[PDB]
Nucleic acid binder design. Sequence first.
RNA 1: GGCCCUUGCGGUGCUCCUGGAGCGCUCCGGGUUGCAGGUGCCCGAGGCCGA
Lengths: 50, 109, 178, 7, 50, 76, 259
Amino acid sequence: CTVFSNFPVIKNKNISHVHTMDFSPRSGYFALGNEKGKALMYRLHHYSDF
Amino acid sequence: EDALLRRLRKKPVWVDEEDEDEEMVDMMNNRFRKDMMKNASESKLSKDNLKKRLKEEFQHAMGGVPAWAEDDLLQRTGNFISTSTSLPRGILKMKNCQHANAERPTVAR
Amino acid sequence: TSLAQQLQRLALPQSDASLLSRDEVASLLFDPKEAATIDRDTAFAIGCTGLEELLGIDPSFEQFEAPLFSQLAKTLERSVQTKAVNKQLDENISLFLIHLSPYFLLKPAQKCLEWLIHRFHIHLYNQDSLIACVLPYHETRIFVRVIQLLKINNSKHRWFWLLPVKQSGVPLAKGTLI
Amino acid sequence: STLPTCS
Amino acid sequence: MKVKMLSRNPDNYVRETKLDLQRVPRNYDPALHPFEVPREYIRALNATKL
Amino acid sequence: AEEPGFLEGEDGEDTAKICQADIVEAVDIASAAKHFDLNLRQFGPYRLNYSRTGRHLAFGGRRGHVAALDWVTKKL
Amino acid sequence: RFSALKRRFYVTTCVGKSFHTYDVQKLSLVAVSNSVPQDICCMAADGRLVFAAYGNVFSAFARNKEIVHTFKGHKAEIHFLQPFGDHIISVDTDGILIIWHIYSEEEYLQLTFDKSVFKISAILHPSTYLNKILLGSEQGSLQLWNVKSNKLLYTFPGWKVGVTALQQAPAVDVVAIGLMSGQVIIHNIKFNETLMKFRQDWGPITSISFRTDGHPVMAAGSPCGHIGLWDLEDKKLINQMRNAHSTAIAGLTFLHREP
RNA sequence: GGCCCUUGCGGUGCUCCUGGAGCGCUCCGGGUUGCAGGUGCCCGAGGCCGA
């Protein structure tokens, strides 16, 4: 129940407003959509399957 | 000094015959042994006197004799820490990838 | 300034300035002005009294009567003897400090430590052993005094991180230690 | 070493 | 080898207390005190002037 | 009260080949501290003078280095 | 290489068809050697001279720059060079071992060893031993020899892995033996007892050196480029140096009486 | 543009080859070192001032 301290890199300033997030069925990918029309995706190295 | 200190407190497997035989070898006229004399009479000494001179020059050069001369993971090389099956807390390992809508760019929400 | 650094590195406790003058004296119990007016006999008396008090509490201290608390120890000064004698003295002082460590909060232990500092200058020759003796009591003020006896001003020194408790006279905090 | 120079 | 170097005990040569006075060993060796005739003549001449 | 120093070899040793490193080990910590080698090659060859009282030493460099120091204690 | 008339250390490294010499005080270049027609395969130094081998012929370098003596007579490449007083020992690939007198260039003594039975992979002359050289094999056997009498003193059964490195320990009668399996065996050759064994899981032990500044520390190289520091007194690993070099370790040495 | 335990932000402690300015060392060799004429150098403060 503790928050990860390194995800939101505030310096980069890409995330902006957030409306939707979703996870891959095996948690391999993390997706995020903003107001600017950019659907960001990140990969979590702990999970090796899509 | 010694009085003050007190108050405060097999057989070799091989033999070489030429080292056994009592021949005498010239420290004179040999550059490497000319630096090793002690007195002027020791121009040419025998085999047994060579052996003890060489050994003490070795030990003085080495600074003496080491003490070591007379189940467990630190008698091998290996690792100690490994990755856990559960997700580690605190720090998340992440790498950004290409945008999902890279092929179809849009400006709306 | 390269000469200054070379000279500062070449300095040794044996060639200490306070060895050759009595303007300043290092003392665990007294002010330096007051401590520079005490004879050897008085310090020897304090040390012997402390050891006699400690003997009643713990018998095993009797073995320290001869080497460190006798006439021979009174006349002894480390500088004139060889490195072997100094090594033997270091061993004996380390053993005595290991034995002193539990009772350090008691006054007789402080008296014995005062005699050792006055005669053998363990604050210059035996820094590691004294620090090991006093370390588990780092919250107490007597630890602050024992640190204040040392000279750790150089930033390259092993115990340089102990400088604030010398400069400010406050006990070391456990968080810094951890 | 104490070997002779030649032969 | 047998070695010895002159090693003075500082407690012999340095006073013990601020109350104490400085200790002065004296050597009457003539080699340490040369010019005995000219040195004494000046003291005698200074005595008459005083 | 004092006595002059002495230095003799044993079993026919010659005192010429005895080096300074051997002496420092067999002599007390007090006299061992008096042997030191200051290395200042940037400036020229040095000329040194001890005071009449043996406590102080002063030296001068060819290129223009001038310094005086107590040498028993290492103070400048 | 220690030097006479200059109380300093010099380290010599091969560079293609020549070699370079640097003082260890500041790693400054002091000499660059003359070229040789073929790439140098093996190198040796004995204070006075620097020996370099190329192809089947090896030469001696004086003043670290210019050759003064060349030695022909081998039909195979030289793989080991051991300076022995005023004499030089050269070991060929096919199995020929010959001792040459340096200045006169004459052939003193020649020996051959069967390639299938005993192929030489390590050469060492233990200190304080008169005219004695120790030879190791890829098979795993060790032979102690006397050059002057030209006889086999003793044969060590050894270990079945095979010898890849030999080093003189800081003792009169103790050697350190490297093996292809990653195991270093510190042995006493006079009475044939093994003092201690250390094992690195990084491949063959390329080189071994001993610390002689008053601390019982041992370092052994690995082809991965890693260095392990073993405590001789307590028979344990002190620490391991990882990625000291990106490529394989060529040679590592503790300076004498230095950390 | 790229950066994902970050920063339009700042600081430290060691290493980094003297032009002349660490000379002299492969071998050979080092042993019997086999009163011309000189006399130097130093010694000036006054403001077409600024504050």
